[PDB]
């Protein structure tokens, strides 16, 4: 319907795509680095989610330049996506309040 709802939907789909690609790319970037732990896909996908939500427990993280670059993309995609949802909620509340005031 409205632009904000559409944008929020698209952002969520975009995020899921970034989570999957980031998981795949993180493993590709980290294998070959002695000591790295972000090296199998199941846990890499878990890592991508706790990174996108900015929780970052510290159980897993990248040690290489390219793994870190991948991490930044996931971080920004998560922060932006969740932020966009907040903006969509605000727009919805603002429209409803204008109606309620009879504006």
């Amino acid at each position, epitope marked *: 319907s409205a632009l904000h709802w559409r944008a929020a939907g698209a952002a969520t789909v975009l995020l899921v795509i970034v989570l999957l690609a980031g998981s795949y790319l993180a493993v*590709l970037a980290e294998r070959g680095a002695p*000591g790295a732990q972000l090296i199998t896909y199941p846990r890499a996908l878990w890592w991508s989610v706790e990174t996108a939500t900015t929780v970052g427990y510290g159980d897993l993280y990248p040690v290489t330049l390219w793994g870190r670059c991948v991490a930044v993309v996931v971080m920004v995609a998560g922060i932006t996506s969740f932020g966009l949802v907040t903006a969509a909620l605000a727009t919805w509340f603002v429209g409803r309040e204008q109606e309620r005031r009879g504006h």
Partner: antibody
Framework: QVQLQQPGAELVKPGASVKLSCKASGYTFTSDWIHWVKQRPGHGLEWIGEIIPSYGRANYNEKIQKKATLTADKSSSTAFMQLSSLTSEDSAVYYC???????????WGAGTTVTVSS | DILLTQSPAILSVSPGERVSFSCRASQSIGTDIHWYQQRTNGSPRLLIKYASESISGIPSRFSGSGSGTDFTLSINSVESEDIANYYCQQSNRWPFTFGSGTKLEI
């Protein structure tokens, strides 16, 4: 059916090189990695390296002298290992194994016995 | 690189008795340990994954346990076909590494 097919043997003259092959069957995923393991007679298993066919990137064991170069042919679903300038120290059984990106070697090839002799 | 220590190198047991193989990691690796069986002239065969997960087609007398640095592969009532070399392998940190192996004698 046999998931990984490797030739039974290869005779190599000292100083020369050889190209081992590992043909894969069964399910193939973008997350699959093909590994190579070396086993000298009477000795244990030694990891040589790995390659991800979907991207073509390979990594190698840093603890040993690099004698191998890994490549893969996506169309023929075959992984290759080029061993160069071999010595008698390189005589052994070389296995290829498939890992689904989750850390363990689910299936192994029969192994190729490489003998370095004149 | 993670060092996996398997000791003793040879384990002697009477037929039908329970036996346990030891694998110790140089640092804590959760449950990222896998076990393989290799008979004379054969290729390694996956027995247990992630320390204790059973694999389809593997006899029920095979089980694994442990976490952290100490792991164990156990065989309830060992039999002739169990005669082989057993190896542990870790996938917690790059690169993957193998233990030196333990031989089972009856």
């Amino acid at each position: 059916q046999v998931q990984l097919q490797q030739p039974g043997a290869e005779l190599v003259k000292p100083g020369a090189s050889v190209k081992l092959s590992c043909k894969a069957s069964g399910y193939t995923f973008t997350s699959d990695w093909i590994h190579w393991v070396k086993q000298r007679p009477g000795h244990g298993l030694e990891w040589i390296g790995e390659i991800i066919p979907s991207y073509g990137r390979a990594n190698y064991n840093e603890k040993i002298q690099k004698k191998a170069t890994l490549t893969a042919d996506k169309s023929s679903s075959t992984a290759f290992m080029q061993l160069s300038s071999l010595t008698s120290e390189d005589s052994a059984v070389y296995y290829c194994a498939r890992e689904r990106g989750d850390g363990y070697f689910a299936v192994w090839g029969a192994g190729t016995t490489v003998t370095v002799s004149s | 690189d993670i060092l996996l220590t398997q000791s003793p190198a040879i384990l002697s047991v009477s037929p039908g008795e329970r036996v346990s193989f030891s694998c110790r990691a140089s640092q804590s690796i959760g449950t990222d340990i896998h076990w393989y069986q290799q008979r004379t002239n054969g290729s390694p065969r996956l027995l247990i994954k992630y320390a204790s997960e059973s694999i389809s087609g593997i006899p029920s007398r095979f089980s694994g346990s442990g976490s952290g640095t100490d792991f164990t592969l156990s065989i309830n009532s060992v039999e002739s076909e169990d005669i082989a070399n057993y190896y542990c392998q870790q996938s917690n940190r790059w690169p993957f590494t193998f233990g030196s192996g333990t031989k089972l004698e009856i």
